[PDB]
Amino acid sequence: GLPTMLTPGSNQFLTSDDFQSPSAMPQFDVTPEMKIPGEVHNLMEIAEVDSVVPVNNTKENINSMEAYRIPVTGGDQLHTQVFGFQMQPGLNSVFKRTLLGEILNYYAHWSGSVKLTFVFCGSAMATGKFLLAYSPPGASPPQNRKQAMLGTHVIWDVGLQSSCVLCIPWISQTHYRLVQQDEYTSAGYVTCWYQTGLIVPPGAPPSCTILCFASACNDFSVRMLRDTPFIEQTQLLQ
């Protein structure tokens, strides 16, 4: 018949090929597709959804509901930090188990800008102002509000609108960062400091609670699928 020649790579099983195969049951009649609501076309539609960030994960708070809550208090204030964590959305104790960081662990590279939304869950008579800073990784982490005001920071006035989005920009020298980061592709730190402080009227609870959210912007991207280092097994499940 026709003279061919078998190249290298024949009779192998590559797990991610796109080949045709003969059907086991031919002329099969499939049930018609009904319009089920909530169709996922892309995995970035899930990572663009805000989810609560366990920033208070100091044991013993990971076996309770207190991991998601941030303590703020009364007098006097402002020589104390509110919270602080590195910017590592795929490899961190803080937010690798969130909705953004779970899909990030299925990939090796990531890129884009990350949002952080902060809800103030105190009473409706409590005032306050905070400084929400982000720092590029060139230098040492800040230790007070004089070193933290030089980076990218917004000032959040708590009022009738009880949320503020600190949008971390994408500042790096590479187009992509690793998910399992290192000293090369480090992204920096995210800190929070008291601007003025909580002023409550008499008869109000003196201490409140801030919740943290994290999601992706519209220029987020992932690349290089891999398996997650999150779930394991030893033998087959019966």
Binding site: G38, L99, A204, T209
Partner: protein, 251 residues
């Protein structure tokens, strides 16, 4: 704007501090088309007698409380004529509208997460066993979460940070959700369409979705203030229709 009003049947619901209306995964509840239907016989369609607001039982948000859940449509078994069509018809299909309301004060504080979890399969507390139906959903009261680990042999694992399913409780925000912040919000309304893999299903052996209310930021106040902050749930079916009329079972 902060004022809304939802009128269904012979019942209205008025609110004055509303966040918005979350509408499912985008779509509105509707009737089953002729393109997708598989039941041959004529379906019944009670407009006013079935699709109206039903007020469930009231719970108490204590300062040490951790969460509750209701499974639907099993929670409306003895609610009016909606529960009488479920017994007489083998098939059912409906969307819902879940209004959850909890007003406290300008001096109270707290937060809640009101999710609607489709096909919320729940895990037992004694592994290598199975739950029973009396431990999944009560007749009208709420099944609550526990702060510690559940020790029972045939109950749901009602620990709160695993949400009774094995997942992270912070990652429940994929589902249609609102937040009752007592600083800014008073009520939370969620319109859920009919989410299933089949076009219709028997609504006795299949809980379509589970409503969960979980306090992330707990409730605190001062001794001058009130010490009873209740939550009330009001659920209306929407575009409900049924097939397969036989004898009532049960009963």
């Amino acid at each position: 704007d902060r004022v809304r009003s939802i009128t269904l049947g012979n019942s209205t619901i008025t609110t004055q501090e509303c966040a918005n209306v979350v509408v499912g995964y985008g779509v509105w509840p509707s009737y089953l088309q002729d393109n997708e239907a598989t039941a041959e016989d004529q379906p019944t369609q009670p407009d006013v007698a079935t699709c109206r607001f039903y007020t469930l039982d009231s719970i108490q948000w204590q300062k040490e409380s951790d969460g509750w859940w209701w499974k639907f449509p099993e929670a409306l078994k003895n609610m009016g004529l909606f529960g009488q069509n479920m017994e007489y018809h083998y098939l059912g299909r409906s969307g819902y509208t879940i209004h959850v309301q909890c007003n406290a004060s300008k001096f109270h504080q707290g937060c809640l997460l009101v999710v609607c979890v489709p096909e919320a399969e729940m895990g037992c507390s004694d592994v290598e066993r199975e739950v029973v139906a009396a431990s999944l959903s009560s007749e009208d009261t709420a099944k609550s979460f526990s702060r510690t680990e559940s020790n029972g042999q045939h109950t749901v694992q009602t620990v709160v940070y695993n949400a009774g399913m094995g997942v992270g409780v912070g990652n429940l925000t994929i589902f249609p959700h609102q937040w009752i912040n007592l600083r800014t919000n008073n009520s939370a309304t969620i319109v859920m369409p009919y989410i299933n893999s089949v076009p219709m299903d028997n609504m006795f052996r299949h809980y379509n979705f589970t409503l969960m209310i979980i306090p992330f930021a707990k409730l605190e106040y001062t001794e001058q203030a009130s010490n009873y902050v209740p939550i009330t749930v009001t659920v209306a079916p929407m575009c409900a229709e049924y097939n397969g009329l036989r004898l009532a079972s049960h009963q």
